């Protein structure tokens, strides 16, 4: 209830003019008071439209100002161009910055003037420094200046922060004011005509530096930020890679005193085990060389901070390092050229000096692993393999973005990347031919996409036709299903919605064991992902072909085989300016349904093969192996205690044993710690990487101005929990400026806290971080009922595409390829279902969401709507609340810290109740209705749709499920069986969980199965209305948790809920009209 004041102050500061007037608009759920709000509105519009003073009416309608609820504030201020500079001149009295062209290796990667690299605009491209975000540099500068101005009179520790950040913004703005501000167009791009006479890499550097200096709360933060901002102005290729590299060695220096374990995918069972740190000497020499490079780059304070820690090597001073490890990834992306980014991968050293004893075993192990995956379904003749064509054709929506191709749906032209749409086009024109897999050769090389991530190399992405997906789909789904229960596939061991994300190293760490962990992300152009890898799979397919008797299955397997034949020789379109290069690359990368699990297989075979060579010199028992994409780790135990010399010799043997297969590696062996892309451990304590740029993005998405603010808030919350903390008021300023909308040149609207923080398709953030807010009031209920009426909108593009002839042909072909003779009873159902997977195409979503925002805006302008009784969540909570009673409690501390970097209140909760131990289905995947969909398809259907579908009669359930690819007999059996009644409750569980972010954010980290939380939640049991007692216990838990988060202290509860209200609510249960935005979720693991 504080945000709107900051909004008002932002408006007053940014505009400042006599002509700048400020126009609130209010609402109340009570008619008479609402008409007085309407009156105030009216009179304000008039007064605005007559240059009359507004300050007089504000007393007359005092009641509305005190008790009614605000919506938004309008603003009439003219163009008044270039006022940002006219304000900014004062904060730029420092010295500007000079580039240094002889730092980056390349020529165009220096921060020199555009004209020195692109004299003509016809060869200009802003894509090497495009922020790719619908928010301006000017927005950032205005926000910083507003923060600095309002915090210009404080006298505390805050002032010690303020002087520091003021100096940082001085350093930045001197450099900016030296030349000027680039001006955004309507699309938030930056054209040639502003950058023609200015440095090319000023924008990303500026934004990244603003984000960093806005995340300063301490002295070391100031040192680090000043030491990166001033060097990131020139160095743009060897900086985040530099400071983020030693961490991998540092984790091998922290003694464990106390540990965490994993059992099943979120279980913990702590251990007081102590483990020393047997680090060799030569890795210190390596580390010393790395610090010499660090100092050689122009870094002074942060080596000293890295140097004074080694005197003790303690874990209490260690979070600084972790903090440092996150300060490296908030400098921006290294958006270099497609060519030079491919050549990070396309350097090959293929040699007729590798072993042959190794590759044959490698090939065989891949073959054997494949056979273990596929023995059962290939043999028992599963339906999903026979009809693999139809399976992939349904599951196209869960695929990659194919190359743009010109379509026509009746009377339009489309350049879609979605392969389902490609299929729709090719069926009509006789071009659909899935059995004949295209070659990939000189006559038709392959396109590319670029998988980027800062501080590392650029990975490549295949962008293929739609036959490759269809071939790989069914076989890869059975392989993944097999890997759900296999432990060693770290990407895929789960229980249908989880990953082993807290690792499985710490079981067998001891004084006798060691662990070798290894980054394997560069192993795409390598000689072990070419020929042997493919041929092992070919061999497995031969065996599997002899392991079935049906012909459809053998054909499907032969098509998958033929796909691997074509992938063994594969060329690659790569432009460079005007001319086009094509390079032989017959190997593996991402952009495929198969790449992930198959790379995991190949790394597993590789490490199993290598690890049987250390056996020539050591006796050990392989206890555990894990492989997940861009990393892999294996633990191993000895007959004795570990020494430095065994570590050194093992490392040399591992390095040379990879060299025997012609494979480069920075081999890393340790005893207590690991480092990988997504996480790392020191001293039996899990830390995480907070490297998600907020004000700069990887590539250019498709979301609106609105939703990118929500994405940024989720990333903000995440990074805060990780450790990287930014000052929240700046973020709120960005959110309001990104939700601000221009109705004319001078009219602009700004919504309020009570529109943006309400559970709908328009939620963006919360008034108090780590806490969703609900509505006990009339007013939040009122607007939630209003916004649900408006969330449902239309897309004319989708309506006209579904009315053409080709779509109709596609629906007909789906039917007669699946079932026939109900052409007007189910086929229409299948069209309505195909509509559910046209929405992946982005412009449809933009049409629909822009329509939602405009419909929202035409009642943000004018007064409010009653919305006609449509029941939602706050209606229920309104009725649950008046039979509560709170009382002060006092819980003790009995749970262990294992995420130090958290804010102290969340940690206090974790340090008093447990951390989560299960993961209950956000999708309802284990639900008996969903185990059909995961059997005949991959398709999601959103929990809104399922929660709705179950509310209907037993007739249209059959239509809706058969329309999702499922056959008719099992649907009829499901309805006759009466299993939906055994699944109303699970679906509603998942629904309510999706509505309230229970599996999305901070609430993913908390134990609701605790005995300590439960004894506070004293709601007696009634029985035979399970939903009510369920929601009551859940909501009471949420009350206690929100009180804990927002105030630190604890409370109890009690609800002697009357049976009358139990029954009144039981009927309100399965008629809920509520919804939560996809863009608002904050997955802690990305």
């Amino acid at each position: 209830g504080k945000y709107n004041l900051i909004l008002s102050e932002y408006l007053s500061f940014i505009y400042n003019s006599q002509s700048a007037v400020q126009i609130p608009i209010y609402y109340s759920s009570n008619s008479e008071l609402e008409n007085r709000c309407i009156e105030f509105h009216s009179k304000c519009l008039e007064n605005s439209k007559n240059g009359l003073s507004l300050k007089k009416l504000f007393v007359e309608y005092s009641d509305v100002i005190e008790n009614a609820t605000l919506l938004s504030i309008l603003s009439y201020s003219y163009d008044k161009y270039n006022a940002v500079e006219r304000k900014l001149v004062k904060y730029a009295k420092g010295k500007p910055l000079e580039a240094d062209l002889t730092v980056n290796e390349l020529d165009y990667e220096n921060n020199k003037i555009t004209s020195e690299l692109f004299p003509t605009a016809e060869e200009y491209t802003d894509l090497l420094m495009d922020p790719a975000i619908l928010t301006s540099l000017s927005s950032n500068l205005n926000a910083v200046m507003f923060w600095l101005e309002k915090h210009e009179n404080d006298v505390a520790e805050k002032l010690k922060i303020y002087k520091r950040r003021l100096d940082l913004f001085t350093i930045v703005a001197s450099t900016v004011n030296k030349y000027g501000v680039p001006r955004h167009n309507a699309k938030y791009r930056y054209e040639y005509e502003v950058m023609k006479d200015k440095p090319y890499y000023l924008v990303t550097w500026a934004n990244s530096s603003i984000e960093m200096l806005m995340s300063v709360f301490s002295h070391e933060d100031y040192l680090i930020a000043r030491e990166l901002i001033v060097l990131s102005y020139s160095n743009r290729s060897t900086l985040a890679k530099l400071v983020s590299s030693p961490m991998s060695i540092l984790v091998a220096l922290v003694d464990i005193n106390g540990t965490f374990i994993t059992n099943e995918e979120l279980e913990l069972e702590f251990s007081n085990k102590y483990v020393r740190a047997i680090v060799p000497d030569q890795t210190f020499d390596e580390l010393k060389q790395m610090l010499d490079n660090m100092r050689k780059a122009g870094l002074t304070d942060i080596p000293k901070m890295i140097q004074d820690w080694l005197v003790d090597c303690s874990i209490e001073k260690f979070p600084l390092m972790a903090k440092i490890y996150s300060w490296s990834f908030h400098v921006g992306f290294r958006k270099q050229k497609m060519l030079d980014a491919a050549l990070d991968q396309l350097k090959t050293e293929y040699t007729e000096d590798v072993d042959d004893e190794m590759y044959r075993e490698y090939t065989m192990l891949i073959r054997d692993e494949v056979v273990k995956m596929l023995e059962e379904p290939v043999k028992h003749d599963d339906h999903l393999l026979q009809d693999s064509e139809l399976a992939g054709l349904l599951s196209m929506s869960s695929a990659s973005n194919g190359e743009s191709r010109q379509l026509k749906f009746g009377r339009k032209t489309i350049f879609s990347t979605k392969k389902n749409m490609h299929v729709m086009d090719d069926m009509a024109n006789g071009r659909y031919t899935p059995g004949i897999i295209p070659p990939v050769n000189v006559d038709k090389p392959i396109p590319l996409g670029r998988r980027d991530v800062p501080g590392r190399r650029t990975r490549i992405i295949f962008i293929l036709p739609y036959e490759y997906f269809i071939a790989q789909h069914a076989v890869v789904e059975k392989m993944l299903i097999y890997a759900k229960h296999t432990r060693e596939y770290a990407e895929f061991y789960s229980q249908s919605n989880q990953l082993l994300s807290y690792g499985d190293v710490t079981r067998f760490l001891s004084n006798n064991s060691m662990v070798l962990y290894t980054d394997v992300s560069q192993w795409d152009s390598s000689q072990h992902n070419t020929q042997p890898f493919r041929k092992g799979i070919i061999m497995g397919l031969d065996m599997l072909a002899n392991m079935t008797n049906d012909a459809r299955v053998i054909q499907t397997l032969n098509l998958y085989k033929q796909t691997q034949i074509n992938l063994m020789d594969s060329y690659v379109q790569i432009p460079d300016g005007n001319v086009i290069k094509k390079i032989q690359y017959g190997a593996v990368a991402s952009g495929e349904k198969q790449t992930k699990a198959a790379n995991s297989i190949a790394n597993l075979a590789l490490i199993k093969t290598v690890l049987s060579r250390i056996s020539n010199k050591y006796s050990f028992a392989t206890k555990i192996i894990r492989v997940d994409g861009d990393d892999n780790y294996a633990v191993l135990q000895f007959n004795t205690e570990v020494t430095k010399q065994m570590v050194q010799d093992v490392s040399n043997d591992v390095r040379e044993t990879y060299a025997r297969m012609n494979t480069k590696v920075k081999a890393l062996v340790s005893t207590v710690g690991i480092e990988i892309a997504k996480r790392y451990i020191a001293g039996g304590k899990i830390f995480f990487r907070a490297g998600i740029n907020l004000l700069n993005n990887e590539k250019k998405g498709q979301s609106t101005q609105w939703d990118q603010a929500a994405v940024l808030y989720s990333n903000y919350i995440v990074n805060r929990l990780r450790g990287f903390e930014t000052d929240r008021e700046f973020i709120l300023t960005k959110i309001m400026q990104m939700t601000s909308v221009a109705i004319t040149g001078s009219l602009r609207l700004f919504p309020s806290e009570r529109v943006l923080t309400t559970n709908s398709t328009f939620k963006v953030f919360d008034s108090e971080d780590f806490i969703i807010e609900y509505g006990t009031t009339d007013d939040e209920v009122y607007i939630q009922r209003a916004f649900m009426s408006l969330s449902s909108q239309k897309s004319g593009i989708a309506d006209e595409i579904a009315a053409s002839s080709t779509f109709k042909n596609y629906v007909s072909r789906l039917s007669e390829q699946l079932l026939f003779s109900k052409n007007n009873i189910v086929s229409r159902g299948i069209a309505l279902t195909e509509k559910a997977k046209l929405n992946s195409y982005a412009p449809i979503s933009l049409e629909k969401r822009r329509a939602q925002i405009s419909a929202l805006l035409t009642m943000l302008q004018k007064p409010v709507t009653f919305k006609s009784s449509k029941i939602t969540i706050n209606d229920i909570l309104r009725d649950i609340k008046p039979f509560f009673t709170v009382n002060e409690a006092h819980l003790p501390i009995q749970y262990q810290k294992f995420m130090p970097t958290l804010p102290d209140n969340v940690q206090y909760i974790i340090q008093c109740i447990g951390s989560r131990t299960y993961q209950i289905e956000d999708d309802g995947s284990k639900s008996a209705i969903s185990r059909l969909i995961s059997k005949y398809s991959v398709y999601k259907p959103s929990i809104e749709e399922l929660y709705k579908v179950i509310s209907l009669h037993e007739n249209e359930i059959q239509l809706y499920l058969i329309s999702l690819g499922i056959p008719k007999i099992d649907a009829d059996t499901y309805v006759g069986s009466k299993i939906y009644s055994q699944d109303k409750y699970r679906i509603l569980e998942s629904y309510v969980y999706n509505l309230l972010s229970i599996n999305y954010g901070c609430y993913q980290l908390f134990d609701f199965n605790s005995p300590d939380l439960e004894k506070l939640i004293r709601i007696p049991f009634k029985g035979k209305i399970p939903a009510v007692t369920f929601i009551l216990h859940l909501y009471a838990k949420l009350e206690v948790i929100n009180h804990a988060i927002k105030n630190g202290s604890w409370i109890s509860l009690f609800c002697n809920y009357p049976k009358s209200e139990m029954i009144k609510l039981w009927k309100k249960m399965w008629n809920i009209t509520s919804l939560r935005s996809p863009y608002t979720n904050a997955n802690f693991f990305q």
Partner: protein, 39 residues
């Protein structure tokens, strides 16, 4: 719409609300099983 005296219908007791809600559920279940057998 309930088969009970007038001073009970306009009441505020717990038992009265309980009676009304329960018998509304009885009537709705009864009408729905009739709709079943008629379809």
């Amino acid at each position: 719409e309930i088969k009970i005296a007038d001073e009970v219908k306009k009441s505020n007791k717990e038992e009265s609300k309980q009676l009304l809600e329960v018998l509304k559920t009885k009537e709705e279940h009864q009408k729905e099983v009739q709709y079943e057998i008629l379809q």
